[PDB]
Design an enzyme around this catalytic site. Structure first.
Site: not given
Ligand code: USL
Ligand code: USL
Lengths: 596, 596
Positions: A171, A412, A468, A503
């Site tokens: 991301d 991750e 989160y 995070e």
């Molecule tokens: O459209 C949706 O539904 C979802 C979309 N995305 C992706 C980012 C598009 C998800 C990503 C998940 N992971 C991805 C990144 N991890 C950390 O989170 C930060 C952030 O996302 O802010 C990043 O910036 C950090 O680098 C990274 O370490 C969190 C867990 C997840 F658990 C669920 C979803 C969705 O549900």
């Protein structure tokens, strides 16, 4: 491997090659036509150091796929040839080929760690051309990992892209180019210092520095330790390669109270001075001990990200960012998700900011049916070999930093799936073998339904969780978020080892408001954090909180990215959101030591 | 069924009951304990008309599930009892039960169309209580449709909600309450006008009004037609129920050049005056003809949405919105996705704004494995019966409006799946039967991979497409968007019937910018529209462009909704984005008639 930070000394020239370079996008024919053998024709100009993607207004430049060519003239005094001439690249993202005149001098893989090469003196003509080709492509073999289908990590109806593009499995935006400074330096030809290793011993109320000095050639070694004012407090001449020095009246490096001794090393004519903070780090029971005191992390995951240089070294912003963290009452941050510049690491040593130092290993996950850690011959991830080189190089670069208290092996990865332990066991073994200070090691845990099968439990000294509750789950239902948060974190708390948030956060657009819980609002960001803290403040093994993120930063394009990632406490130009003031208040009431 | 707009006449009182009412959330026991039989105890105060969800700062109020009770005192002069006393509810969203003193007077289903009830005079005591219970619940039997699982239409990890909540199957917030004014009016008891139907005949260079006057009781009928200045231009006394009047020197109602005659009707003592614009509408070949001239739609899908009243009638904003559309050079809008207030319809007649008049049918789709139009006994959608009542009521309410040129039967139903044609055939048949002007009928087409199987092709007079080339597909790849847009729209163009965009747009946060294509930026919104127009401007059967949306508006919460829907050309407080100025320029160069 050894990578001493280049400095101007009595025996060492330091020539910064930063500035305006010529720049040309590759069109597929750049190597075939051997562009590196002449001046670049029909070229642009690009600042160095910088990411190249945002300097212009060209979408095709920003989203370029493949190689680019940087080039500059390099007309140096001939009397330099009496010295050993070294070209140091602090970072070239992602892969580089370096040419001097027509000649390939080196190739490097890994976009966030330094590499260097001697310039053979038979190659230096009267006028010289330095050419650096830079590859931005990512796949299942690079760190960070790129996806190898047309999938975006962030689609409703399928479409064919106009051009091929990198598809990050992470991301953040794939900023590339000559990210960090390029420098020419010299040492004595015949006897010079190649590496310095320092460790601290605080036992028996006696502070000692243990040194080990790696050299090339034959000469005599000396080491002296000096206070900030320049008083010599220990010194020995004609020493061995290894030894120890007692520091009477030793002042310890402490979070937010730095003290750096100057350690000057002599070997023949060569002279090198290394700043060094004396401090201990250890995990005992459920406590993270710095100088034998129970530490509580307060801070952030960060990114190296500023406008318009992208990932590029921005030293005024580095100083501004540290000033904001002290203003907010933070004591620490993590190098999400790659090693940061040495200029940042050295400034953190100077300012007393504690660092969790992380590798480039993000995207080690193929199932955000082939499993991530299947055998390579069946489609499994192909990063383990490079993952070891990155760990080796990272520890070699940063081993002497007092500010570094913990190594983070990956962010991750697919650590709840079959084969993760076997992938990660050699990497943890390697980091423990290589770090002379034997600092704690962790990997940062992805949020995951089967969290009790996270192999971090079998490997890590500190459990570092990305969670989160209230954003990617329970969005706008914070009462449910609190319950879901408590259920899982009571499991982690029951293991009796230190654990922490690396995070947690909520995308927040500055200027959007609502007195009633509404996602993306400044108030919701505060309420999100209040809810999490309701739980973490009741758990005695929870020893730290690092928010996601310090500041808004650029990402790939998609329906859930509002001009990038908006989870910063600050905006991209470093302005505080409501939650940034919330944290200043909160962190002002939480001590660095003895909170839990 | 007949629903004349209530007006103050020589024979008709009009008492507005709007103001501050008492308000109480139901807790499950409200009907059991018969709250409607006394003053509401421990109640709040709520403005009427308004949606109730955003007036306070309570998330539990905003997200309430189920019933609420409104109540006010109603102390009226006894001499009213010599008249017929009628309580008119212009809209109560979604379902209502109306009590006077202890007594249930009526129940209504459908949240966007008026209903009324006589107050029997034996019920009127000296002091009276009016109680209105309002149900906000949505499911597979309501229009608009609510989902009946825990699914959100906009989740990464599953969670249990704290409380049960409505789950809209549509992209707008479920605002509920007494949305539009509540009024008491009177007519003569014994002979009164119940409905008026007017149609226009322009053949043979002779403009005529055909009337049909529906009455109760026995008396004599008269009709006169008057210019805006009050000159009688046709009149007849002791007339039949049906007849015609020639209008010499007739001025036609035209888009952006309205003319309304006043049609005064007498029946016994009863007097009713109806404004009426004379104009023709017809589809011939690939042309949409208004007054025999080839029209090009320029405008928007809208919402009734303002802060803090939500869906509530806001007459200053209605006037402001029409002023902005004239400023921008628009000529039309669609009542997305429900009938609008009569005050808006009447103002549009006055201002010359063309309206596509849409039912409440949004969410008629169960597969955004049971198919939508499976038999009800196997889980199919249960809306067809109510869908007919809505069509009947909508046409009965709006049939005399010159501004209404087209009926939209549903928004984004599952019209490419099996059974859609059979579901929709009776509804198109019904609208054509009931509209005395026989205006064109359409349904608004969802974007869909199998668009050649959209049953709109077998039913509609104009094909109305919702397409998001460059937003929900090809995001940040506008060159691919252009190609994908041209491929499908050349199919529609090849059918030779009029077709048009009823939605297209891109979420745009005011104040986010980038010179280089970046989703959510003001510049990307402009570039998105330029790309689409590159295609539509080359297609001779494409007869109209209505953007999504006129202005930002509230929705349910989710990861892709930045404090609501951000596709407005204007913000929620009606400030122009970059693309709003783009459209002012574009629409200034496109004539209302004879563009294609
Ligand atoms: O459209 C949706 O539904 C979802 C979309 N995305 C992706 C980012 C598009 C998800 C990503 C998940 N992971 C991805 C990144 N991890 C950390 O989170 C930060 C952030 O996302 O802010 C990043 O910036 C950090 O680098 C990274 O370490 C969190 C867990 C997840 F658990 C669920 C979803 C969705 O549900
Ligand atoms: O997260 C994602 O990926 C998607 C999410 N959603 C849902 C809205 C959450 C999609 C919806 C689609 N339809 C839903 C609404 N239609 C019109 O669009 C307007 C708008 O959405 O702006 C609404 O406001 C109008 O009322 C409605 O008529 C468009 C087509 C779709 F085709 C793709 C996606 C996604 O891909």
């Amino acid at each position: 491997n050894a990578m001493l930070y280049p400095i101007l000394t009595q025996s060492r020239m330091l020539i910064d090659l930063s500035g305006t370079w010529r720049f040309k996008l590759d069109d597929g024919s750049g190597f075939e036509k051997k562009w590196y053998e002449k001046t670049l024709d029909d070229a642009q100009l690009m600042p160095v150091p910088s990411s190249y993607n945002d300097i212009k207004e060209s979408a095709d430049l920003r989203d370029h796929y493949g190689w680019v060519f940087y080039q500059r003239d390099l007309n140096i005094p001939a009397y330099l040839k009496t010295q050993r001439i070294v070209l140091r690249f602090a970072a070239v993202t992602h892969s580089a080929k370096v040419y001097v005149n027509g000649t390939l001098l080196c190739e490097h893989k890994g976009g966030f760690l330094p590499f260097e090469t001697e310039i053979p003196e038979n190659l230096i003509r009267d006028e010289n051309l330095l050419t650096v080709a830079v590859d931005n492509r990512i796949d299942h073999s690079t760190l960070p990992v790129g996806r190898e289908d047309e999938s975006n990590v962030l689609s409703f109806f399928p479409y064919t892209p106009t051009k091929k593009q990198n598809k990050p499995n992470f991301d953040f935006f794939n900023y590339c180019g000559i990210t960090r400074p390029v420098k020419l330096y010299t040492t004595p030809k015949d006897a010079y210092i190649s590496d310095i290793t320092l460790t601290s011993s605080l036992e028996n109320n006696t502070a000692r520095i243990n040194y080990k000095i790696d050299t090339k050639g034959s000469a005599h070694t000396a080491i002296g330790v000096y206070t900030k004012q320049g008083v010599c407090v220990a010194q020995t001449e004609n020493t061995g390669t290894e030894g120890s020095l007692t520091i009477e009246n030793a002042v310890l490096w402490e979070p937010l109270k730095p003290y750096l001794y100057e350690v000057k090393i002599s070997f023949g004519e060569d002279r090198y001075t290394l700043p060094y903070g004396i401090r201990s780090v250890a995990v005992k029971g459920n406590k993270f001990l710095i100088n034998n005191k129970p530490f509580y992390f307060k801070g952030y995951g960060k990114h190296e990200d500023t406008f318009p240089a992208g990932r590029g070294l921005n030293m005024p912003m580095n100083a501004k960012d540290i000033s904001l963290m002290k203003w907010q009452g933070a004591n620490s941050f993590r190098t999400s998700h790659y090693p940061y510049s040495e200029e940042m690491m050295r400034l953190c040593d100077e300012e007393g900011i504690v660092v969790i130092d992380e590798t480039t290993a993000v995207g080690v996950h193929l199932n955000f049916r082939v499993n991530t850690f299947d055998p390579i011959e069946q489609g499994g991830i192909r990063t383990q070999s490079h993952h070891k080189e990155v760990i080796k190089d990272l520890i070699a670069r940063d081993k002497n930093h007092a500010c570094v208290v913990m190594w983070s092996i990956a962010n991750e990865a697919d650590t709840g799936s079959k084969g993760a332990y076997e992938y990660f066991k050699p990497l943890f073994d390697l980091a423990r073998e290589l770090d002379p200070q034997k600092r704690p090691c962790t990997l940062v845990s992805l949020q995951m339904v089967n969290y009790k099968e996270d192999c971090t439990i079998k490997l890590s000294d500190v459990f570092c969780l990305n969670r989160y509750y209230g954003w990617y789950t329970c969005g706008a239902d914070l009462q449910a978020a609190e319950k879901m948060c408590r259920e899982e974190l009571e499991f982690w708390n029951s293991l009796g080892k230190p654990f922490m948030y690396t995070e947690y956060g909520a995308d927040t657009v500055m200027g959007l408001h609502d007195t009633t819980d509404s996602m993306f609002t400044e108030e919701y960001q505060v309420e999100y954090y209040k809810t999490n803290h309701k739980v973490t403040d009741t758990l005695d093994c929870f020893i730290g909180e690092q928010v996601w993120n310090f500041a808004d930063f650029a990402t790939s394009q998609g329906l859930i990215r509002v001009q990038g990632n908006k989870k910063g406490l600050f905006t991209r130009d470093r302005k505080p959101k409501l939650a940034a003031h919330y944290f200043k208040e909160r962190w002002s009431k939480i001590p660095d030591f003895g909170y839990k």
